[PDB]
């Protein structure tokens, strides 16, 4: 009782208005698709999936986090890296812009990296940024290097969207897993015996490189002190224009930590015999800002690299990565790349539309009964 | 020139926090500034008195003026409807700038925002009609009650509002 | 079951004033008269829910049954069933990816780009569709919007 029938060709479509845009995959990648037989992660297979907003299995997502958390554990507070390095600033969950910095900075298969923190919050693709970078750190243990930003803690990730991100895309188990993995992130980085790379800056309680080495990491960043200041300290607004000389002043902008001046930086660089201090933390228009150059060398005593373009979808800033080879500091610059939309705090269109729907309908009816 | 000055007496859960006074740039935006003024006075029968600041995002702004729904969806102007975007002469230069809140082009009601930092991306999209004269400390004090999405921990209200001089 | 004549008498007087050609049936022009109903996104949608027969025009039996879901003496399940119907355009008891988009472009308008609005319509379905059919039911709708107190604001005085 078969008989091939005749169907309507105009009824062979789906309701979906903007057919051209990709629908995120329903498939969750398994350990057999992410990991190789040697336990090596397939980063090119991961990139291709995450860029399409595809998730991994909650179990394998945890594997990538814990495996990379274990590699970060065995690392020191102050890392020992050397040239050719490509230093990167804040990413702030801008995944599709992290994908662009790997083009301008080079593939992790032949290029050495050093991220100064802030992988989470503000940008709505933070869990994709952790899951990719940690995967890279499993595959290139001594090439790719990740530091700790002030956002890599449970205070800021619970205030901002990271906890909600994990809870919506994966679960709270992945959040907790990310939180321990974040504790395991190194604080500083001694690069080519000349540079000191941190997130925020200096501390009134950090005088030598030996101070950072004896510091107790593996905990949630404190409200006061050295570890906090490595992650929170901003340079004093006027750097080289300091009228009343002081070393460290209370950071009124952040609400915690301190501000650091030039006679506070050029003091640190001599007792330790270092060239410069590369940091991130502060958003730059050009993606960088070379500060007052010490006339004894002519090289900037501070750099502030920012790797997040069109920060918060509205700043319209360029982002800069930082290449270093053969005694020259190369400041590459790049713009924004498209990324999918998400409603604030990862909410669905029903929780977003109903308050307006409730209103626009009530006011249609209260302005139809109260016209007589 | 002869620009009006309105006052807002702030109240955290009934208790006073302070007073914020605004200069209304009626010289550059007469229709938009008269709206805020007349709602602060309540001469038209309705207004800002008692209303809350439903959306406070620290480091960004303090949004308020929704005296019909108290959640962001409501609010009405003294012109009956929702008036047009008068002009965009004035920009969101920095902290203290008082500006209108909309639901896109030409949808101005009563809702406004007080910048706690510079918001340049709102230029050409939102109408600026005032600045904080005295009381930026109080707006900074209001900030300590906000959150990221804007939902306030304690209910901040405009306990008293009117015109000065 | 009916209601009480006190409120129905008032509705009827207001209905007659809205009836231009005095037919009973109100068209697109017979509603887009009032200044507070012409520049509002959801007029067309509230008309189509009031129209319980599908003729494209609303009569008296329907003008009563529609504002009945909004009356002071209403209930939660009754009010949300209307909220569901704002998105469910073809009334099949299922909201699609096209129906959900159309209604939202009616509201957000040009303040969001088409691709951007589609992306968040795709994502609402992924996270909210439990049976996997690509569309959303009343049960799948309430599992989302049940925790919030939306029902307390959909009240009008007659």
């Amino acid at each position: 009782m078969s008989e091939p029938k005749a169907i309507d060709p105009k009824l062979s479509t789906t309701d979906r208005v903007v057919k051209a845009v990709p629908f995120p995959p329903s498939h969750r990648l398994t350990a057999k698709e992410v990991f190789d037989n040697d336990g090596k992660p397939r980063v090119d297979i991961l990139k291709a999936h995450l860029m399409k907003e595809g998730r991994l299995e909650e179990s394998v997502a945890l594997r990538i986090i814990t495996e990379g958390a274990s590699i970060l554990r065995q690392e020191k507070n102050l890392l020992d890296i050397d040239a050719p390095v490509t230093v990167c600033g804040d990413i702030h969950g801008q995944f599709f812009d992290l994908m662009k910095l790997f083009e301008v900075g080079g593939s992790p298969a032949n290029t050495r990296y050093l991220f100064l923190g802030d992988y989470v919050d503000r940008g709505y693709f933070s869990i994709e940024c952790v899951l990719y970078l940690w995967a890279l750190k499993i595959l290139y243990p001594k090439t790719l290097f990740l530091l700790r930003g002030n956002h890599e803690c449970r205070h800021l990730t619970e205030y901002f969207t990271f906890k909600q991100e994990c809870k919506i895309k994966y679960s709270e188990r992945v959040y907790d897993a990310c939180m321990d993995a974040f504790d395991c992130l190194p604080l500083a980085a001694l690069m080519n015996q000349q540079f000191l790379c941190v997130h925020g800056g200096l501390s009134p309680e950090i005088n030598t490189l030996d101070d950072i080495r004896k510091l107790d990491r593996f905990k949630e960043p404190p409200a006061y002190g050295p570890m906090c200041d490595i992650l929170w300290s901003d340079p004093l607004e006027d750097f080289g224009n300091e009228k009343t000389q002081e070393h460290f002043t209370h950071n009124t902008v952040r609400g915690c930590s301190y501000f650091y001046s030039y006679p506070a930086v050029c003091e640190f660089l001599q007792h330790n015999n270092l060239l410069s201090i590369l940091r991130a933390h502060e958003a730059q228009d050009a993606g960088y800002r070379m500060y007052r150059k010490s006339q004894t060398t002519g090289f900037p005593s501070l750099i502030t690299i920012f790797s997040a373009p069109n920060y918060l979808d509205v700043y319209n800033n360029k982002a800069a990565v930082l290449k270093y080879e053969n005694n020259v500091m190369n400041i590459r610059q790049f713009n924004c790349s498209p990324h999918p939309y998400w409603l604030p705090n990862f909410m669905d269109v029903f929780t977003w539309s109903l308050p307006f729907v409730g209103e626009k309908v009530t006011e249609m009816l209260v302005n139809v009964l109260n016209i007589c | 020139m002869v620009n009006p000055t309105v006052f807002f007496d702030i109240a955290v859960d009934g208790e006073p926090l302070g007073r914020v006074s605004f200069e209304l740039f009626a010289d550059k935006v007469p229709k938009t500034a008269e709206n805020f003024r007349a709602l602060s006075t309540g001469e038209k029968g309705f207004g800002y008195k008692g209303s809350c600041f439903h959306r406070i995002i620290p480091g960004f702004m303090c949004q308020g003026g929704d005296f019909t729904r108290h959640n962001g969806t409501g609010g009405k102007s003294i012109y009956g409807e929702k008036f047009e975007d008068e002009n965009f002469i004035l920009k969101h230069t920095g902290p203290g700038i008082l500006s209108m809140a909309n639901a896109g082009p030409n949808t101005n009601g009563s809702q406004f925002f007080i910048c706690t930092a510079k918001t340049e991306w709102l230029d050409g999209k939102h109408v600026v009609f005032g600045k904080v004269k005295e009381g930026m400390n109080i707006v900074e004090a209001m900030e300590r009650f906000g959150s990221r999405n804007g939902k306030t921990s304690k209910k901040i209200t405009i306990a008293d509002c009117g015109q000065l001089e | 079951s009916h209601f009480d004549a006190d409120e129905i008498k008032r509705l009827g007087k207001r209905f007659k004033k809205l009836d231009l050609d005095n037919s009973g049936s109100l068209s697109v022009e017979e509603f887009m008269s009032l200044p507070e109903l012409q520049q509002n996104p959801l007029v067309q949608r509230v008309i189509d829910i009031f129209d319980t027969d599908g003729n494209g025009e609303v009569d008296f039996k329907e003008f009563i049954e529609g504002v009945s879901q909004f009356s002071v003496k209403g209930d939660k399940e009754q009010k949300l069933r209307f909220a569901f119907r704002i998105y469910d355009m073809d009334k099949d008891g299922y909201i699609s990816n096209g129906e959900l988009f159309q209604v939202l472009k009616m509201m957000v308008g040009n303040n969001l780009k088409d691709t951007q609005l589609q992306q968040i319509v795709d994502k609402t379905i992924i996270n909210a569709d439990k049976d996997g059919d690509g569309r959303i039911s009343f049960e799948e709708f309430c599992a989302v919007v049940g925790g919030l107190d939306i029902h307390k604001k959909m009240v009008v005085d007659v």
Binding site: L343, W352, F356, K360 | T73, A103, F113, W121 | -
Partner: peptide, 11 residues
Amino acid sequence: XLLVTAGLVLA
């Protein structure tokens, strides 16, 4: 992102 709207809050 950082917007000020009245009804549908965007990114």
